[PDB]
Structure 1
Amino acid sequence: DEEKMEIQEIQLKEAKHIAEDADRKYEEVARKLVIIESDLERAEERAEL
């Protein structure tokens, strides 16, 4: 039972760490998309002119 304890403990800690890394990878792409969308709008206005 104690062996099963330490196994599930390291499992849970690794899962929490990978969830946090996924959250950071989520965080960057939002502002990336925002600046790309602004460039898209500017290019569209140039094309209309």
Structure 2
Amino acid sequence: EAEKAADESERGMKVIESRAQKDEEKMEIQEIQLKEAKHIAEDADRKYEEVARKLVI
């Protein structure tokens, strides 16, 4: 019983460890995408505001 439990826990070890590492990879991907999205949002804000000032003129 103890041996089978230990082996089951080993299988769990590897499964969950991999899950966590994958999550970290996803974290990095999401981070760079969020930075790009924020840059694009600031760009669009600036563009719209400049157009609005020209419009007011």
TM-score using structure 2 length: 0.77
- 4+ residue runs over 2 A deviation: none
Listed one character per residue, the Cα deviations across residues 2-48 of structure 1 (whole Å, up to 9, x for unaligned) are 11111111111111011111111111011101111111111111111
Q: What CA distance in whole angstroms lies between the structure 2 residues aligned with 1:9 and 1:17?
A: 12
In the alignment, structure 1 residue 34 sits paired with structure 2 residue 35: yes
Aligned positions of 1:1-49 closer than 5 A: 1-49=2-50
Q: What CA distance in whole angstroms lies between the structure 2 residues aligned with 1:37 and 1:43?
A: 10
Amino acid at match of 2:47: R
Q: What CA distance in whole angstroms lies between the structure 2 residues aligned with 1:44 and 1:2?
A: 62
- What are the ranges of 5 or more consecutive residues in structure 2 without an aligned counterpart? 51-57
Percent identity of equivalent pairs: 20
Aligned length: 49
Q: What CA distance in whole angstroms lies between the structure 2 residues aligned with 1:32 and 1:17?
A: 23
* RMSD of aligned alpha carbons: 0.9
Amino acid at match of 1:25: K
